[PDB]
Structures are given as structure tokens and as C-alpha cells.
């Protein structure tokens, strides 16, 4: 018998880099002024974002029926580790199921090849349970539907780490010049050419933040919860799935960027991504707010010590990127500057939050 | 104060994806009939092999820093949090200069902005030193070189998913037929291109096997290890970049392998590759044996119950690459099949490795 902690912690890193990678169909779409009018290049985008959005759901849903079942497993040996290996060599071909499926639907053969790895995903994971029904030492101590706290943080770290490496792998494809482009812009000058990129720089540490506040805040979450119930798995699920598309809106070397568009309109795509992203992580936070003696700890219950803290660190980003797409929405002038200052000021009030709602607080309290 | 498990976990799966993600440069490398006999294209896959391993290399440095300074942390808060998610932004970012300095060594741009990288990362690390220093509630209890093991496994868990998740990506991209492809191939008839296709599915199995199979013989390897020392770290690191080579050996759409080649040379190539990712955990295993006292469990020790079986799963592929090399050597005939037999055959031998150690050691003793 052996721990089964590493070998579930590397299929949760497996299935959720395979989750994330739906995205990249979504990023190279390209789309050019000659087919700007065309209806079938818009309708494709559509396409392709439902489909990342599918293949995202039913990689999850795999991951849970994993953890699922070795809940009940409990302790691992080497002939289960192989079995898991298997079932998760299976788990990684859906991928190329669903794109055959996604270029050939009228023809069966991408959903006779989905039904298949399905199957077979079946099949390994009941030789896994009458594996270890069969040998009671290996079976869990409770045995001889909330899911794991730990599994849930594992994959929504993975998930996070794949989008800022998807925008750092953006830059160093886009902001890099060639060295014909800088002999034809100056005479061999590369600070100029870092001079003409410094705003992608910037842009990409902005995005950077942003990704790395929404998981400061969805860490905070997860420390003070007690127990994570099956409906704020779903809710994380759905945030995570959102959190995915991060990458569409603030890339610049993607075919999706580089398309004809207004400025208004990727600003507004942008705070609807984040938007989407965070208010599922504060629709988890209410429903454990609703059960709160079993779903957290007494810290951030009504009433508690750090209740608000976390109410307005889980509130910050949704508020404000509401805040963005409504200036863009009314004012149609400042909006982009308003979304870039909500960009930069959004890490600060982080940083600063406890002082914030100290002084909030308290001059609410007094007048 | 607040426990540092889930965000150094976080750290861990950021950095290994961003040391692995170095070889896609080396993958997308093309050559062509028109510039076989060119000397340039040769000389930049070598070349571009060299910048993989130090890119790997400087990542894998900056991860060692970043645990080493959070063995004395030892518990986090919301600043250190922030600060650390800084440090991380930091650390993306040298990839970035890496490119720039690979594009123009000769101009000093690259040069600089790799400095003032690593200057960040120091002083942000001297600023969190600093405050956990001035609050002594947030130190470790010891205080208040060998590396820890949790930290050394979730980054050789994510190097090695995200080598998977590169083999699934290129399947994706190569296998898959377009519809004008299919029709005039065929009268639309795709079970005809799944039949031209299936060897492609075929390998695929037999890479993510390979992968998996090394991953087992790391996690039991870890999973008998007392105490990791830092010479075990450092083979671990060689191991590991000598692992992010795989995809270099097992794609089809990387531009890499479309080149005029012979088969003979691509097998010799992937057998050196596997034998560089496998002796190094040998090493490890050899190292951790010299002292196993203070480095192994009493299972593994020389004579142990566990310790030939431990020794035959280490092993079996660097042996089994070595032969297959040798045959391309010798034999210069059934190298090939020799190769796809092995490839096929490992994983059995590591189903049925304890019958097999079984059966030999009692047949040696009788005889
Ligand atoms: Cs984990
Ligand atoms: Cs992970
Ligand atoms: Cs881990
Ligand atoms: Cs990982
Ligand atoms: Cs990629």
C-alpha cells in the first residue's frame, strides 16, 4: 500500500492543462478586413468559443468522476497507479475525439471514436474499483457527495498557471521584432524597437495582475472553507471555465486580436470575460455564506473578523470591471481610460484593501 | 498567518510550465530539402537545443531560490501572498528577455533586461526576507542545504503534464483531415483517412506510455526517499530537462521532425533522448544508495525487500534504449522494428515486473 496523494495531485495538473488548452482553437481565430462583412468567420468564432466551453465541461466532469472514485480507493499501488495512468492516457485523447467531431459533425466517425474513449475510460476505472474491492487493504478506512478541497485547488491552480503562460508565451511570439523589421523601421536601432513595444510590457504585467489577484482572491476563499459542498464545485467549475478565456482578452499576437474592431468593443469583451470570471467565485462565497457552519470557518461567518475582508476581496473585480463596461456603455469617451486605470488601481486596492475597509467602515459606522 | 502550502504549490506548477514550455521554440524549428545541405538551419536546431537547456536551467535556479527562501518563511500572509505573486511576474518574464537575447546577442537591450529581471526577483525575495524578519509570528519555528521534497515533485509532476499535454496538442494538430483534403483523396469518405491515420493514433499511445511509465519509476523512486539532498536535486533537474526533449522525439506536426531525415537517425535521436531522461533518475537512485541511511527508507536499503524491484524499475528503459541504439549500430537492418517492439514491450515488463524479478532471481540462485 502507498500514499495515493502525488499521483492524484499529477492527474489533476494532467486534466486541468488538458481543460485549459481548448483555448487555443478560440486564439488562433483569424479574421481579416476582405472577410470582415462575411458571416460565416463571426459565426465561427461563436462556434469555436461554445465549443471550448463544452470540451472544458466534460474534461471537468472526468476529473470528478476520478476523484470520485478514488475517494473511495483511498491508497494506491503500483498496479492502480498503472490503471490511473491508463485511464488518464484515455481522458487526454477526448481532445482529438471532439476536434474530428468539431470538423466532420455529419459524419459519425468522430462520435463513434468519443463513445469509444468514453468506454474505455469505463471499463479502467470499474477494473480500478473491483481492483481494489477485491484487496481490502487498499480500500479507504470509512468504506472498510462534496468533493475534496484539495483536488478542487490543485486543478484551479493548474488552470491559472496555463492562462499566464498562454499570455507570457503571447509576448515573447508578438514583441519580439525581426531583424529586417528593425533594419527597415531605423538603422540597426533595437532600442527603438523597445521604445515602440513598451506598451505591450506594460499590458502584459497588467494581465499578469489581474489573473494573479483573481487567484489571491479564490485562495483566500478556499483557506477559510471548511467544506467545499457539490454546488460551489460546479460554481468553481463555471469560474474556472471563464477564467479560461482570459487569454482572449488580453493577447495581442492571437488571430483573435488581430482582426478588424473597435477599441470600445475589446474593452467591453474584456470586462465581460472578467466579470464572468469573478462573480462565480463570490456566487461560491454567498452559497457558503448560506450554509455557514458546515461550509466555513468561524472567521468569515456573519458577522465575524474577516467576513468583509473577504466579501470585498471576492467584490473588488466584479464591481469594477461592471464598473468599466458601464462607463464604456454611457460615457462612450473616457471608457478606455477608465479601463486602463481600473486595471492598474484594482492590484493596489488589493494591496491596501484592509486599510480601505478599516476606514469605510468606520466612517459609515460614525455618520 | 496562514498556511504556504497551496501558494508555493501554485509557484511550483507556474515555474515548471514555464522551464518546459522552452523546447517549443527547438519543436517549431523547420527545415527543408531546399536547405538540407544548408549549414545555417543545422547549425540553428543545435544552437536552439542549447538555449532549451539553459533557459530550463535559469528557470529551474530561480525556483530552488524561491524554496529555499520559503523554507524559512514557513507561513504566509495576505502581503507575502501579493509579494510573491510579484516574484512570479518577475520570473515569467525572463523568458521574454531570453528571446530577445537569442534574436540580438550581439545589442546589449536583451542583456540588460535580463538583469533588471533578476534584480527584481532580488529585491522583491530581500523585501519578503525582510518582512517576515520584522513580524516574528510569520518565521518557521526552527528559526524562529537539502531541498524539500514536496516542492522538487509538483515540479516534475508539471513538467512532465505538460509534456504529455504537448504530444496530445500535436496529435490534434497533425491527424486531424481537412474536408478538401478528404474529397480529394476519396469521394468523402473519412473512415478512409481514420485508416491512413491510425498509426499516428497508435504512437501517440505509445508516447504518453513512455512518459507515464518514466513518471512511475520517479514517484516510486520519491515515494522510498527519506530525504532528497541537493545532488539528488540537481539530477533531478537534468532528468527533467533531459524529459522536456520528448515531444522533440514523439511529435509529427513539429516542424522539427518534417525534415529529410532518415528513419534510422529519428530512432537513434528519440533512444538517446530516453536514455538521457532515464539514467539521470538512476542516478539519483545510485546517490540516494551511497548514503541510505539518511537518504532512502529501510525497504530500499541494500538487501531490502523492495530494493531489486526499485533497482529493475530504474532500470528497465535506460537498458532497453541503450539496446534498442545498439541494434541501430550494429544490426542496421531491424532497428526500426526493434524500437517499436521495445516501446511496446517496456510497459508490459512494468506490468509484470515483480513476477519477472521473481522468476530471474530464483532461476540465478538455483543455478
Ligand atoms: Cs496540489
Ligand atoms: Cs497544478
Ligand atoms: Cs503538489
Ligand atoms: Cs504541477
Ligand atoms: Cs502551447
Chains 1, 2 share one sequence.
Not at 478514488?70 to 475525439?97: E, H, R, S, W
Not at 506594460?202 to 467544506?227: E, I
Not at 473578523?305 to 473616457?334: G, N
Not at 481600473?342 to 467602515?361: N, T
Request: glycine share 4%; net charge neutral.
Amino acid at each position: 500500500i502507498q500514499c495515493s496523494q502525488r499521483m492524484l495531485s499529477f492527474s489533476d495538473a494532467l486534466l486541468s492543462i488538458i481543460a485549459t488548452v481548448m483555448i487555443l482553437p478560440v486564439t488562433h481565430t483569424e479574421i481579416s478586413p476582405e472577410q470582415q462583412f462575411d458571416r460565416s468567420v463571426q459565426r465561427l468564432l461563436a462556434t469555436r468559443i461554445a465549443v471550448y466551453l463544452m470540451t472544458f465541461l466534460i474534461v471537468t466532469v472526468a476529473w470528478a468522476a476520478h476523484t470520485r472514485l478514488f475517494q473511495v480507493v483511498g491508497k494506491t499501488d503500483d498496479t492502480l497507479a498503472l490503471l490511473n495512468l491508463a485511464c488518464m492516457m484515455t481522458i487526454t485523447f477526448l481532445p482529438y475525439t471532439f476536434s474530428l467531431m468539431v470538423t466532420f459533425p455529419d459524419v459519425p466517425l468522430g462520435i463513434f471514436l468519443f463513445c469509444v474513449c468514453v468506454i474505455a475510460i469505463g471499463v479502467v476505472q470499474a477494473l480500478i474499483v473491483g481492483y481494489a474491492f477485491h484487496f481490502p487493504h487498499l480500500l479507504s478506512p470509512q468504506i472498510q457527495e462534496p468533493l475534496s478541497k484539495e483536488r478542487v485547488e490543485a486543478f484551479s491552480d493548474g488552470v491559472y498557471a496555463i492562462v499566464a503562460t498562454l499570455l507570457i508565451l503571447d509576448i515573447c511570439e508578438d514583441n519580439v521584432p525581426d531583424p529586417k523589421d528593425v533594419k527597415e523601421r531605423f538603422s540597426g536601432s533595437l532600442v527603438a524597437a523597445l521604445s515602440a513595444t513598451g506598451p505591450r510590457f506594460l499590458a502584459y504585467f497588467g494581465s499578469f495582475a489581474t489573473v494573479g489577484l483573481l487567484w489571491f482572491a479564490h485562495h483566500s476563499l478556499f483557506l477559510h472553507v471548511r467544506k467545499a459542498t457539490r454546488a460551489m464545485g460546479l460554481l468553481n467549475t463555471l469560474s474556472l471555465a471563464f477564467v479560461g478565456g482570459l487569454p482572449l482578452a488580453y493577447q495581442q499576437t492571437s488571430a483573435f486580436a488581430r482582426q478588424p474592431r473597435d477599441e470600445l468593443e475589446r474593452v467591453r469583451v474584456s470586462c465581460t470575460i472578467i466579470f464572468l470570471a469573478s462573480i462565480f467565485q463570490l456566487a461560491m462565497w454567498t452559497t457558503a455564506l448560506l450554509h455557514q457552519a458546515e461550509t466555513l470557518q468561524p472567521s468569515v461567518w456573519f458577522g465575524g473578523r474577516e467576513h468583509v475582508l473577504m466579501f470585498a476581496k471576492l467584490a473588488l473585480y466584479p464591481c469594477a470591471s461592471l464598473l468599466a463596461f458601464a462607463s464604456t456603455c454611457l460615457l462612450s469617451r473616457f471608457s478606455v481610460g477608465i479601463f486602463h486605470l481600473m486595471q492598474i488601481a484594482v492590484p493596489c486596492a488589493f494591496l491596501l484593501l484592509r486599510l480601505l475597509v478599516g476606514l469605510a467602515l468606520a466612517t459609515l459606522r460614525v455618520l
